[PDB]
Design a protein around this nucleic acid. Sequence first.
RNA 1: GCGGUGCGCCGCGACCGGCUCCGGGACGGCUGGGAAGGCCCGGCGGGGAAGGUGGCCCGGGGGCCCCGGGUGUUACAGCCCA
RNA 2: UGGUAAGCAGAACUGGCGCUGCGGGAUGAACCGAACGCCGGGUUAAGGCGCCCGAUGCCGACGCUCAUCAGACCCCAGAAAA
RNA 3: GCGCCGGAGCCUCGGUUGGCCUCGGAUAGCCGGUCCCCCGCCGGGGUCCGGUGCGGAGAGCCCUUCGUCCCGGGAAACGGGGCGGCCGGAAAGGGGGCCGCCCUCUCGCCCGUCACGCACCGCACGUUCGUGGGGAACCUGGCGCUAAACCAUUCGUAGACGAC
Lengths: 109, 138, 199, 190, 176
Amino acid sequence: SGRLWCKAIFAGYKRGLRNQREHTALLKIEGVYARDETEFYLGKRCAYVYKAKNNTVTPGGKPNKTRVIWGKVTRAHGNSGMVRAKFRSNLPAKAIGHRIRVMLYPSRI
Amino acid sequence: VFRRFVEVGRVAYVSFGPHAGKLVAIVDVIDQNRALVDGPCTRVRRQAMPFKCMQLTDFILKFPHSARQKYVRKAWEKADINTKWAATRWAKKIEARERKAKMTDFDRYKVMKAKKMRNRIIKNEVKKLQRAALLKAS
Amino acid sequence: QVLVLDGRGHLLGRLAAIVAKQVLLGRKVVVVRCEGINISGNFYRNKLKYLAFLRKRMNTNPSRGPYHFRAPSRIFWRTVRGMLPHKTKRGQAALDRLKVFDGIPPPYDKKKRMVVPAALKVVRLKPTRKFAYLGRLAHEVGWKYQAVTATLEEKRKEKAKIHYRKKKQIMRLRKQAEKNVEKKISKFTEVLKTHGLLV
Amino acid sequence: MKTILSNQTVDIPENVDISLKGRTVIVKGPRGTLRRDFNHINVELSLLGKKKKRLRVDKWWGNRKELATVRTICSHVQNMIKGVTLGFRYKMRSVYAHFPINVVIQENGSLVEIRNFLGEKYIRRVRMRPGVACSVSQAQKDELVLEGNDIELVSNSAALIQQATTVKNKDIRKFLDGIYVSEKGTVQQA
Amino acid sequence: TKASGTLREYKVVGRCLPTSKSPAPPLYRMRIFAPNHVVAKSRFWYFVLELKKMKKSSGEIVYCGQVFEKSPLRVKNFGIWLRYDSRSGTHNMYHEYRDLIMASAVTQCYRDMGARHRARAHSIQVMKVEEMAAARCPRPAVKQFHDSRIRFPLPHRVLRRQHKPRFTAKRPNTFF
RNA sequence: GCGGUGCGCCGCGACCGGCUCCGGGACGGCUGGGAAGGCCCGGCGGGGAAGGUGGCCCGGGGGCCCCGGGUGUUACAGCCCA
RNA sequence: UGGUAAGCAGAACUGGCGCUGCGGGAUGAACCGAACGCCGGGUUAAGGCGCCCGAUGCCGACGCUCAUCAGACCCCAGAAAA
RNA sequence: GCGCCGGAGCCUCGGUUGGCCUCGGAUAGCCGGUCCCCCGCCGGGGUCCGGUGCGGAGAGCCCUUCGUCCCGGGAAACGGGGCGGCCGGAAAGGGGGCCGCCCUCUCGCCCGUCACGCACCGCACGUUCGUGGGGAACCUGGCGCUAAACCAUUCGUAGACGAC
C-alpha cells in the first residue's frame, strides 16, 4: 500500500579537503539530526534506485527500465547525525544531492 | 511586566543537564549566572546549578537563605508543592507529551480511528451551524 | 516539497549560510520579503561597505566588470552566490533551485512562510547593538522600486487580515461545534486523551 | 560589573494622568496630550498606587552605559509633565549694530521671515516644528516668543531661528549680530 | 603550567635528602592548585627552588595528596593574592570570587586574569587564598550578592537550541 | 549415496575464527582506613554575629494589606563555632 | 663579523632543500606534521569543525570589546613615540 | 495543412514515492475570547476573563485505503457523486467558495457478526505524483481558419560590405 523506506539525501563522498575517497559515501537520513539518534540505522541496507534507457530483468516480474546499486550503512559520521555507507560498485557523482532509500530489513527490533 | 523573580525559596523546573524533569527550590545566589538549589522530595541532591538550565515556576516556599535540607523538605511537604505541581496545566501537557512519545503501533491505529470519527461529526455540526450563521441576514 | 522562507528580521550571512547548504542538499528554497533582511552594525557602516563595493569596477571596460546589483533580492542572491562553488555544475544546479523576491509574489502570498530561528536578529544580536535594513540600504544605494513594493505589500496585508479574521470566525464555529457535540464524541476523545493528544 | 538593580521614580502631580502602553508613555492634562515611544532604551516601566501618582523605571543586569538611560527617562517624563501643565516658552532677542531685524509672522505663527539682517536683500524663511507658535512682545524693541508643549520641538524650532542668522566670511567676535535664545521658561507661572 | 579543566588543591610537603652534615633536614609544606599530582610536584619544585636552595635531584617529595573542600555546599567569599607578569614589569593584585570550593575560586581566578589582563598559566603565581566574611570584602561585583532578601528576574532569555527545528512556523518568545 | 572440482547469471541466510569501534550490567581496593551529607529540630551545657527572623518607630500601597530603612541576639525563622 | 639596513656580504654548530612526494600553512624549493611497494578496515599527528569544505546543527563555561579604517593564528607578508 | 476539442501504438528524457489555502508583528512582552466608549464602510481603542515554557501548540494539524457479500448498533438526511447559470482573480490574473436543478443512491464514517480472492510454497529494484515532459507518426469524429518573411527591383533622411 504505502512507503517502506526512510529517505536519505546523498550529501557527497567520504573525503578530507583536497582528497576524496569514493569507496565510502556520506548519507543524510531525514529526521535524524544527532549521533544518539542514528544507532537504529547502523547495518541497514541502502538502495540508489535510478532508471536508464535499456530494459534490465527484474527479480519478481517484468523487465523494466529501473536499476539499483545496493549499499549498507557502516558508521555514524561526525557530531550532527550523518552516516557513512558503502555500495557494491562506487555511486556515480551525478547522484550528489539526490534521493536514496534507507531500508529496514537487516531488522534489529 | 515581570511576575516570576529568582527569589530565596522560589521553585524552578530544571529543563536539561543532569536532573532534566524535576523541581528544585532556589536556596542561595552564588554569582550573577549560577545558583544553589535543593530538591529533596524530588530526588535532587543539594548542589550548584546554572540559571540557564532552569525554567522557573510560580510557587514560593519560605525559609532562610542558608537553611539545611531538613527545613526545605519540611517547607516542601508543608506548602504541598509536589501535589500542587501536578494540578497545573504545565505538568498536564508535560504528562501528555510523554504519553504521545510512548504510543505503540496498535495504540497509533486505535487513536487514528477515534480522531477520524471525532473529525467527521465536528465536520457535520460546524456546517449545520454555518446554516444559522448564514440565514439570520441571508 | 518547496521551502518558502520569510526574510523579515533574518541576518544576511546567517540566513544565506543555511539556504546555501539546504539548496546543495537538493531542496528548492524561495526567500520572500528579501527587503526585511537586517544586517548587524549601524547603517552608516553598512552603506560605506556597499559604496566601497560600487567603486570596484574593471578599469579598461566596466561592461565586463563586477555587476553591482541593487535590489534587496539580488543583493541577498549574490550573498548566497558567495557561499557556493558557482563556477562548477553542482554550484550552478544549486543557484537554479534558489529563488528570491522583493515583497511577496502571488503563489507565496497564500502560503505559510517558515522562519529560521538560527538566523534571526532577536536571538543572534544583543538588544543593545545597532542594525540596518537591506530594503533601506538598497533604496539609498540606487534601488527604484521601494515606493511601489510598500503599497503593494500593504494591499496584501489588508487582504490577508480580512482572510485571517474569516479563519478566526471558522475556529469559533469549530469551538462551538465540539461543545454542542460534548454528549456524543465523549467516547472518541477519551482514547485521544489517554495518549496525550488533547490534555 | 553588572549592577543587579538601578531604579528611579517620577512623582506625578494630581491634574495630569500618565498612561503606559509597553514603553509608550502618554501624558494627558490641562493644555494638551504628549506621546513618546521609548522602544529603543530597553527598561521596565511600572505605574504604582491609586490615582497612579508614581512611575518606576527599573533596569536589571545593566552595565555603566545602560545605567545612564534611567535619569534620562525620568527627566524626559518630568519635562513631558512640565510641558502638559505649565507649557514651554523660549524668548529670543535680536542684537545688531546698524541694520535692524524686521520680524514678520506668516501662516498664523508656523512661519517667520527675517528682513534686513546685516543689510542683506535675501529674506530668510524658517518654519516652526508642529505645535510651536511664534509671537512678538508688544513695544519691546526686538524679542521673539515661541510657545509650545513639547520641549524637544520648541527648542529645535528656536535653534533653527538662531542658526538661520549667521555672519559668514567675517569676525564673529566683532559682528555679534543675530537672534539669540535670551531666557527659557514655562507659559503659565506656578 | 596550563590550567586545564577545574584545578585541585594539593598538599605537597618536601625535604632535602639527608647528607652527613644534617641527618634531620626540616620539612616544608606548600598548597599547589594544579590539574593533577604530576604538575603539582613540578610547581612545588619551582617555588621551592625560588625560596630555598633546594632542587629535585637535591631532595625528595615526602607527601602529595589532594586537599578536599570541608564544606562544598556553603556559599563562601574567596580573597586571592596574585603575582603576574604584564608586558612591562610584574604586578601584585587582590581578587575576590564567590564559590563553594577554593579550587573552584582559583580556576575562576585564572579565567578572570586570562579574560581581563591576557595573563596566562605560566605567568600567574598564587601566594595566599583565604575564605572571607561578607563584611570584609572591598569589591562591589561580589558584595552586591550580600542581600538576604535577594530578588531579580531573568529578563531577555535568548532562545538556546536554535537548530532543533531550524525551520519553525512561529517566531520564538523571549519573555518568560 | 559416499569423496573431489564447480555455481550459466543475479542474490540472501546461518554458525565458527582474526582485527576493530561501541553499548549495557555487576564485583572490589585505596584515601584524612575519603571530604561533605542524610535520620534522632540527637540531647545537654555555655558562648558568639549578621546577608537580622520575631517585637517596635519611620517614609508609602490600597479598602485595614505588604514593602524599603532603624533598633538589636532570641522570639512564631535559621547559620556557624568550642 | 662587516654594513644604517637588505630577499646584502662573510663564518661556527645541528637540521633541511638540492636528490623528495605526502597531510596542514588559501597560494609557495626550505616552515609545522610525517618520509612513500600495490590495496581494505581501524586510528592518529600537525591543523581544523557558519557556508565554500570532510567535521561543534555541543540547549559548551567564564570574562573582554563597538571601530564614520573593528578584529580575526609559527615562518608571514605593512607599523612607533606620544 | 494548419489550429480548438472529442482510440490504440511508439520512441526518448528523467526525477519523484500524501497534503498544509496565508494575519500583522512584538521579543523589558505576547495570544485568544468580552460590554459601556470615539474614529470609520464591519473593523479598530480602553474595559473585564482565560491562556502563556506558547495546547486555538509546526514538539503542530489535516488525510489515511487490502477489496467484497450478510445482519444489527452508533452516526448521517441541513448527505455522497457527476449539470447549465448565479460571484471573484492583474505584483508573475489560475481552478476555487456558494446556490438551485437536469441529478442518483441511502452505500461512504465508526464498533460487532459472515465467509471469501494465484494461500504463487523465507527473499531485490514493491507502492506514487502519471491520462508526467519531448518528439515522429497512424486512426476515427466535428468545428474552424487561407498568411507573411526573405531574396530580386526601387529609394538615398542611410551606407566600406552587410545593415538601415
